[PDB]
Design a protein around this ligand. Sequence first.
Ligand SMILES: [Zn+2]
Ligand SMILES: [Zn+2]
Ligand SMILES: [Zn+2]
Ligand SMILES: [Zn+2]
Ligand SMILES: [Zn+2]
Ligand SMILES: [Zn+2]
Lengths: 130, 130, 89, 89
Amino acid sequence: CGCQFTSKLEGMFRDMSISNTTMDEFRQHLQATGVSLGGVDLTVRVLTTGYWPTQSATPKCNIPPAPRHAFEIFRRFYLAKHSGRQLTLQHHMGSADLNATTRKHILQVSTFQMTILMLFNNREKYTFEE
Amino acid sequence: CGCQFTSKLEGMFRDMSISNTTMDEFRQHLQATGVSLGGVDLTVRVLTTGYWPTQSATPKCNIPPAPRHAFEIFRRFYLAKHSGRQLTLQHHMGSADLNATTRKHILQVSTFQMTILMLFNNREKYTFEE
Amino acid sequence: KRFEVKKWNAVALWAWDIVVDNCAICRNHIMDLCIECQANQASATSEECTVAWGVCNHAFHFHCISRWLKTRQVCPLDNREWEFQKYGH
Amino acid sequence: KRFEVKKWNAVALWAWDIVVDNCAICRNHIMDLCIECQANQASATSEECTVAWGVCNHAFHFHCISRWLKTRQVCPLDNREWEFQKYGH
Ligand SMILES: [Zn+2]
Ligand SMILES: [Zn+2]
Ligand SMILES: [Zn+2]
Ligand SMILES: [Zn+2]
Ligand SMILES: [Zn+2]
Ligand SMILES: [Zn+2]
């Protein structure tokens, strides 16, 4: 096609490798601090809105204690640099590994079932209204 | 005298104005965060050891609850967006405004009487042993 | 507990000095149209007067940066030459 | 309470990659002398083998930094000319 969209392509790939370096950087920062216990193994990727469109609406539903504390730590870190501008509140992206427990089988939740499962952990026997 | 110590002089003055800009930057970052009632009014400055020598020993005395929370917030902020900077704990520098309470007269403590007055607030009737 | 989270992999988006609620070129709002279009309508041509997104995550009214490219061409909020990648919001 | 703190004005000092406990030029320790001195004494001329402090807030042994300055003065860690501003510790 030529160098006209392949430029945005390099944009995306660069975002990717740079967020991988940012993941190693944040690992050392969590070893130096890591106040929020909820923020454990974190693969936070710092991408630019100038390349990645908003999925549907960028939601801000109840965050789950572990990923809540995790999101608070990530937002505090991201605002320590850009005063005010913190981690964008979104739930329509990513994944997780839910360690369940006869053996300990670890499940997987793609940032959608974390809140419902956390509310179940807090109190079972819920419904759509809850 | 000539340009030989006046260089370190510019060093110090630059430290000063730059720490004033850093104070405005931290005001922004504590407006995004600063959830604890420990960061009501904070005036943290940032200097370099390459220009400002140690006073006597850079001690490690117990800090007071609200100054404890303020120093914790400042250290968490500094141990993040800064270029490998290590927030140091020192009591032999600075001041404070102790709001006492017939009127509400605000006192002043130069980072030396904060711990003793905080221990008095926690429990009065102390002595040298306490 | 019965379910405990071990790993997480959020992706955190970031915005520069877009100042969601004001344009740095004309100073009006993230909406409320611009200085050239004034009122929301006032011949806005089916609301084509939209927001422009740069590679440096800086957001202005399309119109206000477009006209800034007839005089300068280096984004007033840093120094980067500035591109025309994402649009709308 | 009877006394409540309203304002505070701490001054927070900072250290770069001085790594208090190791020198980045010879890798020995913040003390324990250097590779050119080995033993604490071993003719250290009344312990003149001290720590050098740069403007970049980096700290390596005097002998070690002398050899680095003799060649290229760009600081083994970052990229600063390195000045003999502060000394000792
Ligand atoms: Zn505008
Ligand atoms: Zn317009
Ligand atoms: Zn820009
Ligand atoms: Zn050495
Ligand atoms: Zn030596
Ligand atoms: Zn250096």
